[PDB]
Design a protein around this nucleic acid. Structure first.
Lengths: 171, 34, 379, 39, 17, 172
RNA sequence: UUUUUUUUUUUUU
């Protein structure tokens, strides 16, 4: 195996609905990590989808309704751009600019509610100079990149001279 | 079998059949080979 | 030549002796199960996955063997062993990038018993462009699946149509033909029901033989007496074009009927588009001899009809009857005499017979031999 | 061209061994201008 | 501040005359 | 592999915001993220960060600040020749072309924009040059590593005697 | 007039 680079457009939208509003970030990872308990999406995009769900969970904004009324909070996120990722999973077949929607209930101890995601990834054949996917993290929140990468079922590496390259999907 | 020659040329041909149905097979073969 | 040339099956094994078949086997059986089963539910499955799935399902099926299979200088096993379904064609490795799919991780094995049957039935049903027939077949298929794994539900919903392009593929039809041949030899197999989907492939593009056989059976005469009664140098070219030493016919266990599917022949000489005069004369005789399968044939054009009808009617009267009156017995040698000596005009009795043979016909379709007969003889 | 639609070409095409019918047409009395046959 | 994600900044500035 | 890499460097740093800065820590936090979405040369990412460190040490005021306290503004500029000990292995070839970045910085109390114009390129000359690390005048104290980490650069305070760059995990 | 085809025939006796 060897490092392979993959450039692609990405578009993301995530929503989480629950009560007893959503304290601390650890529960963010734990809850949203169960967006694919019974996956029926297009295989071959699982690494991309897991990375993308992690990205969206990182920088989700709670809605003003959370501030004003506590009865039903809501958390939203939305992203779009072009990024290039290094990975070693294998070789990816042709992609497509098709949307994918997922919607699931979750229940982690004290928290219970619903998750609804909508994503779209598609390969780019251009000659632009796109940024790395990792840089799309704000870095103003959360701590450590191995543990959180594991919370989603995603094993990465910490190359000294470069940036993070995937290893595999634990699942 | 019988021969039927093209009148104009006198060449030889032999009309076979489509054989779109099945053949037959008597019991003997089954008790004669295995 | 704005038309196309003709090719023969024997002229294919005189070069190469292995029928190639290209597939992919990189992905496991469970992944292909997911891909096919879900792709059909959404309705965006790719062909390559269906090919590889049928390969990975019809691979543990086998049977015994009684006798001496061989064909066009080829051999298949030997009495007293076991064989598969893909031991009839040569496998190789397909190359090039492959598409993706929609995978599932819960697919019980029991949903393979009826899936290859489903896909073969789809191949069959996607061949006739008529809503009534199409829905009759797409309900018979569901009933067939029900009798096996009832609580099966229809896939590929009734809207945007799929599986009608697959006829353009070359490996899929090879798979279907091999399946049909194997389950046609072994009819007592418990999984023979797969042949519900693969029966259209056997005599395909060969509707010039079938007519010859039907005429041989209806008439009741031998084949020599039948080929004697031609009386035109328009079907004789076609008759000579259908009867050559090689291209072994009358051997049920041969590769001829799949000359189209397996690729042994591009344009079969036995078509109804390259033997239109023969087709028309044969099935007009059949129509004038109180046959059922004569009023649904097609009426090919660019053929001069004024000649064939008289010969067909003469032959029908000859078989159906047997001046001093018509001669007794049936032989052309003493029939052309009576026709010639009384000039070319058909007897009124002959036309009465022709009309009474087609007096009553309930259903008729445009460009049918029934239509022509009811138009010219009903006068 | 009018002939092709009147006088179809009927004759023996395939013969069983040495039994080809021969045209017995030598009598010149037809005898008017009625349509002749052939093509 | 007791929670996470309960807006950030609201960059648009109302802290002005 | 203790690799000594030489380069000429030029750096021009500018900061705009309201709520003029008081403590250097806030400025350092603001500047540390100057590369939110990097689309520059892949191989040049770490060294620029080191050079950003230099820019941080050299924050300057202008008479604009002296003219009004409601339009904070800082300038800074440095340039010269240097060489860096590093344990990243081997660096690709580098070219001499200017590069520029302008990003918005948001740490809450402080909000504004940060602009960095950098130009780092090879020195094919064969002469010796002093250490890049012993080039500033802000030697501060023994917590130099803490500042470097706060930017996101891991350095050494071991018996080596210098502050060699170590690693990534610059994200935290 | 993509491509072939030409019983809105066919699991099998």
């Amino acid at each position: 195996n060897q490092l392979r680079y993959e450039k692609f457009f990405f578009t993301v939208k995530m929503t989480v609905r629950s009560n007893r509003p959503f304290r601390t970030y650890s529960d963010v990872a734990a809850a949203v990590s169960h967006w694919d308990h019974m996956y029926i999406g297009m295989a071959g995009k699982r690494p991309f989808y897991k990375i993308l769900a992690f990205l969206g969970s990182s920088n989700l904004k709670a809605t003003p309704a959370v501030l004003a009324d506590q009865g039903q909070p809501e958390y939203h996120a939305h992203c779009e751009g072009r990024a290039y990722l290094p990975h070693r999973m294998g070789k990816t077949p042709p992609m497509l600019n098709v949307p994918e929607h997922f919607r699931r209930p979750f229940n982690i101890g004290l928290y219970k509610g619903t998750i609804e995601l909508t994503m779209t990834i598609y390969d780019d054949e251009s000659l632009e100079a796109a940024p790395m996917i990792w840089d799309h993290f704000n870095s103003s929140k959360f701590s450590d990149f191995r543990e959180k990468a594991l919370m989603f079922g995603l094993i990465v590496e910490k190359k000294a001279s470069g940036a993070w390259v995937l290893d595999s999907i634990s699942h | 079998s019988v021969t039927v020659k093209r009148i104009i040329d006198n060449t030889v041909i032999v009309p076979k059949l489509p054989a779109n149905e099945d053949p037959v097979e008597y019991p003997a073969d089954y008790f004669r080979k295995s | 030549a704005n038309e196309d040339p003709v090719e023969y099956p024997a002229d294919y094994f005189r070069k190469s002796k292995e029928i190639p078949l290209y597939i992919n086997t990189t992905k496991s059986l469970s992944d292909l199960r997911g891909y096919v089963y879900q792709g059909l539910k959404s309705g965006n499955v790719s062909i390559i996955h269906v090919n590889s799935y049928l390969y990975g399902a019809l691979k543990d099926i086998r049977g015994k063997l009684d006798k001496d299979w061989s064909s066009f200088g080829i051999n298949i096993g030997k009495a007293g062993d076991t064989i598969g379904i893909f031991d009839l064609v040569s496998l190789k490795a397909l190359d090039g990038v492959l598409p993706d799919g929609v995978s599932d991780a819960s697919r019980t094995s029991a949903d393979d018993k009826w899936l290859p049957l489903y896909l073969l039935g789809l191949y069959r049903v996607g061949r006739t462009q008529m809503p009534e027939y199409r829905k009759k077949l797409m309900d018979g298929l569901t009933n067939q699946c029900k009798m096996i794994n009832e609580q099966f539900e229809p896939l590929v919903p009734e809207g945007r149509d799929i599986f009608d392009v697959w006829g353009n593929d070359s490996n899929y039809t090879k798979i279907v033909a091999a399946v049909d041949m194997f389950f046609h030899m072994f009819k007592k197999h418990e999984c023979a029901s797969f042949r519900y989907g693969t029966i259209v492939s056997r005599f395909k593009d060969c509707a010039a033989l079938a007519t010859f056989g039907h005429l041989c059976k209806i008439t009741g005469m031998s084949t020599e007496d039948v080929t004697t009664w031609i009386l035109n140098r328009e079907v004789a070219d076609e008759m000579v074009q259908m009867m050559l030493p090689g291209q072994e016919i009358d051997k049920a266990d041969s590769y001829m009927p799949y000359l189209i599917d397996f690729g042994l022949s591009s344009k079969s000489p036995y078509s109804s588009v390259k033997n239109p005069a023969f087709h028309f004369w044969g099935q007009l005789t059949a129509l004038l001899l109180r046959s059922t399968r004569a009023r649904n044939a097609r009426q090919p054009d660019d053929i001069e009809y004024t000649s064939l009808t008289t010969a067909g009617l003469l032959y029908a009267y000859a078989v159906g009857s047997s001046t001093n009156a018509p001669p007794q017995g049936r032989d052309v040698v003493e029939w052309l005499g009576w026709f010639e000596d009384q000039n070319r005009k058909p007897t009124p009795d002959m036309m009465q017979y022709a009309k009474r043979a087609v007096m009553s016909l309930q259903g008729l379709r445009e460009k049918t031999i029934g239509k022509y007969a009811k138009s010219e003889f009903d006068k | 061209a009018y002939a092709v639609g009147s006088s179809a070409d009927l004759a023996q095409q395939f013969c069983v061994g040495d039994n080809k019918y021969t045209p017995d047409d030598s009598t010149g009395g037809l005898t008017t201008n009625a349509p002749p046959q052939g093509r | 501040k007791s929670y996470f994600g309960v807006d950030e900044m609201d960059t648009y500035d109302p802290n002005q005359l």
